[PDB]
């Protein structure tokens, strides 16, 4: 038996079972696992989501799990609802306006379904921009907020979950709830890094700053991991006040075997730069090369170019990169922020949405990052052909709210480590998946207390270890309060 509001969605053609709809919602960016849903919902307003979830809560024996597909950027089926209902969130963006910049210019309201690129465009039109980003802008507000949302700005602003004033969340009961640190703080905390377990974000209120016009964009080259890591930490350390001048700090690892090809494929270095770095590696007999990637944001002011030149020259003077290996670009701010989709349209060397992506993303405590470098970059990854960036950069724990669902290492400094392998042949995929297990096995045996990011575990004890036992208890508490029927985002494999 169906409720009247639920059947209306089927009547309006919003709830679909055709092979076209179900197929499109059965694969994801990872391109490794697939799972057909029974149906796909295309909501025209938030009321349609209320209707679906109210029906689910007020129908005994309801057998259909529900997932909220943003853009399906998930790597291992986290956005699937096997034999259930997948919500095509983007359908919410098809009047009223889905992105509302505040009157006072302090925040931007965006629909959970909206992709960050559009949030950026609407913000820039009104002279503002969010402060904390992801590397890739074609992800959804609600998708990144269910994880954390990390990029090179997070060391100073925290992850994207640390830059949300409030949210509208339709809970697993079918109830629209507005939440913040004040009103319904428990739900607010649960949903942020919550892996879609407690409800769907329909609106997020995102902190903004005045929009810079340009980014001075620099790469610094190292052959010594100790110098590389020390300088990253120097650039990201809190002052004896706030954080230094840098707007963004990330880093890259280049393995010797494919050094020239990989440097050239950054889209940053010229062929002249590449030849010099390759020569440097040969001179130092390096099996690995490291590059800090950093920016300084500034405006159109006439002095700004000179002020940034002085600020940068000052900053660079404290660093220990190989003398003469500072490489400098200057681009529009939006161009920098959208660099990754920029490459996707340009070349798509990584076969985004085209080939399998057995990506490994994790947080590594600072005290063990040198061991990780030895065991992985100078160990496991040596003598292999790698297609895809190896990104390494430190984060400050102080800018993370451990009350929120997202799990991080306990140390004050930890590194985002993103091994973004793209698979060609099928034997490459199995090799890469094995290599990922081998990396995690290494860390386990070495006693490295890492946390995975944007990964799903298939074992209960693994999820318990992931959150920590005490934090796990409050995760289950929130699951019982907000999704007692355990229908939401089953692809995370936490309660399903």
Ligand X SMILES: *Cc1cc2c(cc1C)nc1c(=O)[nH]c(=O)nc-1n2C[C@H](O)[C@H](O)[C@H](O)COP(=O)(O)OP(=O)(O)OC[C@H]1O[C@@H](n2cnc3c(N)ncnc32)[C@H](O)[C@@H]1O
Ligand Y SMILES: *[C@@H]1O[C@H](CO)[C@@H](O[C@@H]2O[C@H](CO)[C@@H](O)[C@H](O)[C@H]2NC(C)=O)[C@H](O)[C@H]1NC(C)=O
Ligand Z SMILES: O=C(Nc1ccccc1)Nc1ccnc(Cl)c1
Ligand U SMILES: *[C@@H]1O[C@H](CO)[C@@H](O)[C@H](O)[C@H]1NC(C)=O
Q: How far is CA 189 from each of CA 145, 324, 330, rounded to the nearest angstrom?
A: 11, 46, 38
Binds 40, which of ligand Y, ligand X, ligand Z, none (CB < 5 to 8 A, cut-off by type)?
Answer: none
Q: Measure the CA–CA gap between 496 and 493, rounded to whole angstroms.
A: 5
To ligand Y, the closest distance from the beta carbon of 287 in angstroms equals: 5
Q: How many residues belong to the site for ligand Y (CB under 6 A)? A: 11
Nearer to ligand U, 278 or 316 (CB): 278
DSSP 350: T
Site for ligand Y in 203-262 (CB under 6 A): 203, 256-257
Other CB atoms within 10 A of residue 283 CB? 10
Tell me if 285 contacts ligand Y by CB under 6 A.
yes
Tell me if 136 contacts ligand X by CB under 6 A.
yes
Tell me if 48 contacts ligand Y by CB under 6 A.
no
**Given 28, 48, 73, 373, the catalytic residue:** 73
- Reduced to 3 states (helix: H, G, I; strand: E, B; else coil), residue 119 is helix
Nearer to ligand X, 244 or 388 (CB): 388
Dihedral of the alpha carbons of 351, 352, 354, 359, in degrees to the nearest 10: 90
Member of 97, 127, 210, 484 binding ligand Y (CB under 6 A): 97
162 is in an annotated binding site: no
Q: Which two tokens stand for residue 178?
A: 């507005």
Member of 337, 352, 395, 432 binding ligand X (CB under 6 A): 352
Binds 389, which of ligand U, ligand Z, ligand X, none (CB < 5 to 8 A, cut-off by type)?
Answer: ligand Z
Member of 142, 244, 358, 409 binding ligand X (CB under 6 A): 142
Member of 8, 278, 280, 420 binding ligand Z (CB under 6 A): 420
Contact yes or no for 195/457 (Cβ under 8 A): no
SS3 assignment for 287-305: CEEEEEEEEEEECCCCCHH
Q: How far is CA 401 from each of CA 240, 259, 397, 479, rounded to the nearest angstrom?
A: 22, 38, 8, 19
Q: What is the DSSP string of 302-316?
A: TTHHHHHHHHHHHHH
DSSP 421: P
Please say if 250 is a catalytic residue: yes
Other CB atoms within 10 A of residue 372 CB? 24
Tell me if 389 contacts ligand X by CB under 6 A.
no
- Reduced to 3 states (helix: H, G, I; strand: E, B; else coil), residue 326 is strand
Please say if 293 is a catalytic residue: no
Q: Measure the CA–CA gap between 5 and 54, rounded to whole angstroms.
A: 9
Nearer to ligand Y, 325 or 353 (CB): 325
- Reduced to 3 states (helix: H, G, I; strand: E, B; else coil), residue 143 is helix
Q: Measure the CA–CA gap between 107 and 365, rounded to whole angstroms.
A: 32
Q: How many residues belong to the site for ligand X (CB under 6 A)? A: 37
Nearer to ligand Y, 174 or 358 (CB): 174
150 is in an annotated binding site: yes
Binds 139, which of ligand X, ligand U, ligand Y, none (CB < 5 to 8 A, cut-off by type)?
Answer: ligand X
Please say if 157 is a catalytic residue: no
H-type alpha helices, 338-455? 339-346, 369-372, 426-446
Name the phi and psi angles at 135, rounded to 5.
-65, -30
Tell me if 151 contacts ligand X by CB under 6 A.
yes
Question: What x/- string results for residues 7 through 46 when contact with ligand X is judged by CB under 6 A?
Answer: ----------------------x-----------------
Q: Measure the CA–CA gap between 466 and 472, rounded to whole angstroms.
A: 8
Member of 54, 178, 266, 287 binding ligand Y (CB under 6 A): 287
**Given 231, 250, 262, 338, the catalytic residue:** 250
Member of 82, 111, 143, 199 binding ligand Y (CB under 6 A): 111
Q: Which residues are annotated as a binding site for trans-zeatin?
A: 135, 343, 418
Interface ranges with ligand U (CB under 6 A): 27, 31-34, 285, 287
Q: What are the catalytic residues?
A: 73, 135, 250
Interface ranges with ligand Y (CB under 6 A): 96-98, 100, 109, 111, 203, 256-257, 285, 287
């Amino acid at each position: 038996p169906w409720p009247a509001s639920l059947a209306a969605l089927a009547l309006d053609g919003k709830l679909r079972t055709d092979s076209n709809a179900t197929a499109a919602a059965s694969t994801d960016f990872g391109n490794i696992t697939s799972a057909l849903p029974a149906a796909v919902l295309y909501p025209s307003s938030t009321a349609d989501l209320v209707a679906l979830l109210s029906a689910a809560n007020s129908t005994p024996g309801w057998p259909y799990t529900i997932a909220f597909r943003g853009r399906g950027h998930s790597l291992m089926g986290q956005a699937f609802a096997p034999g259930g209902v997948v919500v095509n969130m983007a359908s919410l963006g098809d009047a009223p306006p889905r992105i509302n910049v505040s009157a006072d210019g302090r925040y931007v309201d965006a629909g959970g379904e909206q992709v960050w690129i559009d949030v950026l465009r609407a913000s820039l039109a009104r002279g503002v921009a969010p402060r904390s980003w992801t590397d890739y802008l074609y992800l959804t507000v609600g998708g990144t907020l269910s994880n954390a949302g990390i990029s090179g700005q997070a060391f100073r602003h925290g992850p994207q979950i640390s830059n949300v004033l409030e949210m509208d969340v339709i809970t697993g009961h079918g109830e629209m709830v507005t939440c913040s640190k004040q009103l319904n703080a428990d739900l607010f905390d649960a949903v942020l890094g919550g892996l879609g377990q407690f409800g769907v974000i329909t609106r997020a209120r995102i902190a903004v700053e005045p929009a810079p016009a340009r980014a001075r964009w620099v790469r610094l080259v190292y052959t010594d991991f100790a110098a590389f890591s020390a300088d990253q930490e120097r650039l990201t350390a809190p002052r004896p006040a706030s954080f230094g001048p840098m707007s963004y700090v990330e880093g890259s690892v280049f393995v010797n075997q494919s050094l020239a090809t990989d440097l050239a494929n950054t889209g940053f270095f010229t062929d002249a730069d590449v030849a010099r770095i390759v020569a440097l590696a040969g001179e130092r007999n390096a099996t690995t090369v490291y590059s800090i990637e950093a920016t300084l944001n500034y405006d159109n002011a006439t002095a700004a170019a000179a002020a940034v030149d002085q600020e940068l020259a000052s900053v660079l003077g404290t660093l220990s990169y190989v003398e003469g290996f500072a490489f400098q670009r200057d681009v529009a701010y939006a161009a920098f922020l959208d660099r990754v989709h920029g490459e996707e349209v340009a070349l798509n060397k990584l076969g985004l949405w085209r080939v399998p992506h057995p990506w490994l993303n994790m947080f590594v405590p600072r005290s063990r990052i040198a061991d990780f470098d030895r065991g992985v970059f100078k160990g496991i990854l040596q003598g292999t052909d790698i297609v895809g960036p190896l990104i390494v950069y430190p984060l400050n724990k102080s800018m993370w709210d451990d009350g929120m669902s997202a799990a991080t290492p306990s140390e004050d400094v930890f590194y985002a480590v993103s091994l973004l392998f793209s698979s060609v042949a099928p034997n490459d995929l199995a090799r890469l998946q094995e290599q990922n297990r081998r990396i995690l096995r290494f860390c386990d045996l070495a006693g490295i207390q890492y946390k995975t990011y944007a990964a799903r575990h298939t074992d209960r004890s693994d999820w318990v270890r992931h959150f920590g036992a005490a934090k796990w208890n409050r995760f289950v508490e929130m699951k019982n309060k907000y999704d007692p029927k355990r229908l939401l985002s089953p692809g995370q494999d936490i309660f399903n």
